[PDB]
A = this chain, B = another copy of it.
Amino acid sequence: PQITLWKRPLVSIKVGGQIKEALLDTGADDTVLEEINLPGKWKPKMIGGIGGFIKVRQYDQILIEICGKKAIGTVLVGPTPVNIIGRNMLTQLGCTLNF
């Protein structure tokens, strides 16, 4: 799809047997979700920083479907005000900026 930016790019995502709303964020390096139980191993990871560090759970090679196309990448699970789809997953979807 082509998405204009007059409003926030919230999309619907399928992940871990759940449906969630998330933000296509070209300004984020990583993908962060909250309130989900992902399969497989996880390692702790300190992210963020400015104001202090926040610990999350890093799951690797997690599938996320968005408007039809599927992406597989690392997902960080921890507290976040909005579910973020960072560039690590945007690139797996073939997402580009165009103007």
Contacts and interface: CB of A to CB of B under 8 A. Distances in A.
Label chain A's interface by main secondary structure: loop
Given A5-B91, A50-B81, A96-B3, A26 B29 contact: no
Q: Indicate how many identical chains form the complex.
A: 2
A8 B24 contact: no
A98 B98 contact: yes
Contact of A2 (B9, B51, B81, B98): B98
Contacts of A25: 25-27
A62 interface: no
Contacts of A1: 98-99
Nearest to A6: B91
Interface of A: 1-6, 8-9, 23-29, 50-51, 69, 81, 84, 87, 90-91, 93-99
